[PDB]
Ligand binder design. Structure first.
Ligand SMILES: Nc1ncnc2c1ncn2[C@@H]1O[C@H](COP(=O)(O)OP(=O)(O)O)[C@@H](O)[C@H]1O
Ligand SMILES: [Ca+2]
Ligand SMILES: [Ca+2]
Ligand SMILES: [Ca+2]
Ligand SMILES: [Mg+2]
Lengths: 57, 160, 375
């Protein structure tokens, strides 16, 4: 009995912790995609700004 | 700005409330309280299309009325109503010549301020002096006191 | 989707197909000119039986599909790829049939007669199109530039065309095409990177390094001096991060890749550099208009997106030509799409609506007579 109770508790813990892990994972991909896009456009903007500055000179 | 502000005022109250909500969504967490090139590009990515930076600048320049380089609510309405092209389908060259002739009733080659004012008087709507001055400036480029045919052609952009 | 009976402007430029409806300022469907063919044979069940990928569908998978270029130097190699790319653009992106609106296509200068007759026949017999029209790219680019004078330098992917137009006047005798462009630059960068140490021999990597070049490679303002100062590199060499993650380190090679354009001897060809060929073309023109050609030179093509081309052109022309007059070089923003933009503004005129070629007259006349009618 004691072992079965402990195992059931552990299983419930598995379900809830795995669910949160799946959520965190989805959040990872979303955050990563936004971060990459932001860095790409930031590098693009910096290169264009340096070039237009050279052209201004 | 003309057709843009016209369409803006043509919006309904519920539409303008949705526009304010969408503005709050776009400036959600911003640092200037308005939609700049950064925030506009972020919204474009959130949608899917990618906008050129010079294009973002030219667009913000085609919607602002203040001079901030960013899009506020008053400019949010313009940026969210400019879709329909009101100034398209330009009148035929013969129709444009007719317009210039009937605005130049005394047959001289110039639409003096008197003709423009009598025309505004004839239209029937309550003509405000500010409206007269703004239209006179919009037409008469060199500000010589009359709208020639080239200045009159310039008067047809944003008009339909 | 479209409520206006207007021609579909489809620029089938070498390397990038740009398709869109007339009146727009930029092409909506932009995809590379590549065809991916299933290399192996799978025993799997359920996957698409489609035997011919195209566009982004091929770009998304370059490891399984052997990549073939549908255009080489200008001459069309395979016509099946042609039918594939048009059928795809018609019934997968635009979602419109060609049986309801015209189609203003853009072809390169000085192309074979077989190419023109073939595309026209596929556009009339197979597909039911009310009217076709072939147009040279240089004129539409000069239109989009908003001028009537200058020498257009169109550098695509496998061909480079120099076309002088003064006061709107075309010069079919001076147009000289040379097959030096982005592919030969990709090959030069590939062989020099193989000399650096990272060796590859597959097309997917070739496209990857092509993209790396488009993003990073620029033109040098002084080749030998940059070589000397890069001998001891610090900020001159850059470390790029491959989309896969491998850390690549590229230094001087960048600004030595497009230099092959200025020194064709690197690829062992007696042809002259793009600048020297343009200069020779200017001598072939008359003296009276040469100054105007110096003051109104225009550029076109995706290859011109590199930073530093205008300054290099100015120094080279100043070193070649006298330094007494004024030689201003003008490059309009977003020049690459400008050609397509021209198409749009060319398809809205009623007169141009009167200069189309309907099916019946072509059928009786035949394709060769159609070639005479256009020029
Ligand atoms: N954004 C870009 N940056 C750098 N090079 C580019 C870019 N886009 C295209 N190219 C180069 O231009 C060539 C294709 O040009 P093309 O699309 O034929 O120009 P056009 O459509 O004006 O004829 C390719 O070799 C490619 O490397
Ligand atoms: Ca503002
Ligand atoms: Ca008058
Ligand atoms: Ca005036
Ligand atoms: Mg080109």
């Amino acid at each position: 009995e004691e072992a079965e109770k402990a195992a059931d508790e552990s299983e419930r813990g598995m379900k809830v912790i795995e669910s949160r892990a799946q959520k965190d994972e989805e959040k990872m991909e979303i955050q990563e995609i936004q971060l990459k896009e932001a860095k790409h456009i930031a590098e693009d903007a910096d290169r264009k700004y340096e070039e237009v500055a050279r052209k201004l000179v | 700005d003309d057709i843009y502000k016209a369409a803006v005022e043509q919006l309904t109250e519920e539409q303008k409330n949705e526009f304010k909500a969408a503005f709050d969504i776009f400036v959600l967490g911003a640092e200037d309280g308005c939609i700049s090139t950064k925030e506009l590009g972020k919204v474009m990515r959130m949608l899917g299309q990618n906008p050129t930076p010079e294009e973002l600048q030219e667009m913000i320049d085609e919607v602002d009325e203040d001079g901030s380089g960013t899009v506020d609510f008053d400019e949010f309405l313009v940026m969210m109503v400019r879709c329909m092209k009101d100034d398209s389908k330009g009148k035929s060259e013969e129709e444009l010549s007719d317009l210039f002739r009937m605005f130049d009733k005394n047959a001289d080659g110039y639409i003096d301020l008197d003709e423009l004012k009598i025309m505004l008087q004839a239209t029937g709507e309550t003509i405000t002096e500010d409206d007269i001055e703004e239209l006179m400036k919009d037409g008469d480029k060199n500000n010589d006191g009359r709208i020639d045919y080239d200045e009159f052609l310039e008067f047809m952009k944003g008009v339909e | 989707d479209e409520d206006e009976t207007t021609a579909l402007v489809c620029d089938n430029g070498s390397g990038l197909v740009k398709a869109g409806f007339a009146g727009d300022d930029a092409p909506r469907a932009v995809f590379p000119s590549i065809v991916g063919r299933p290399r192996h044979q799978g025993v799997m069940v359920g996957m698409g039986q489609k035997d011919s990928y195209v566009g982004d569908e091929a770009q998304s998978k370059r490891g399984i599909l052997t990549l073939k270029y549908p255009i080489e130097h200008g001459i069309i190699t395979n016509w099946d790829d042609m039918e594939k790319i048009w059928h795809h653009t018609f019934y997968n992106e635009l979602r419109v049939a060609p049986e309801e609106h015209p189609t203003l296509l853009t072809e390169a200068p000085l192309n074979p007669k077989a190419n023109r007759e073939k595309m026209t026949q596929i556009m009339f017999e197979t597909f039911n199109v009310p009217a076709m029209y072939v147009a040279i790219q240089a004129v539409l680019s000069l239109y989009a530039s908003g001028r009537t004078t200058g020498i257009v330098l169109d550098s695509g992917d496998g061909v480079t065309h120099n076309v002088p137009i003064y006061e709107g006047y075309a010069l079919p005798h001076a147009i000289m095409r040379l097959d030096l462009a982005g592919r030969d630059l990709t090959d030069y960068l590939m062989k020099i990177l193989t000399e650096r140490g990272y060796s590859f021999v597959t097309t997917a990597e070739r496209e990857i390094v092509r993209d790396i070049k488009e993003k990073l490679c620029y033109v040098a303002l002084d080749f030998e001096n940059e070589m000397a100062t890069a001998a001891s590199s610090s900020s001159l060499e850059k470390s790029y991060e491959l989309p896969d993650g491998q850390v690549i380190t590229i230094g001087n090679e960048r600004f030595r890749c497009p230099e092959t354009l200025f020194q064709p001897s690197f690829i062992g060809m007696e042809s002259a550099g793009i600048h020297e060929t343009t200069y020779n073309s200017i001598m072939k023109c008359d003296i009276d208009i040469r100054k105007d050609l110096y003051a109104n030179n225009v550029m076109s093509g995706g290859t011109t997106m590199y930073p530093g081309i205008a300054d290099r052109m100015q120094k080279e022309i100043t070193a070649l030509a006298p330094s007494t007059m004024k030689i201003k070089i003008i490059a309009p923003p977003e020049r690459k799409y400008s050609v397509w933009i021209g198409g749009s503004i060319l398809a809205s005129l009623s007169t141009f609506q009167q200069m189309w070629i309907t099916k019946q007259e072509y059928d009786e006349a035949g394709p060769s007579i159609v070639h005479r009618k256009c020029f």
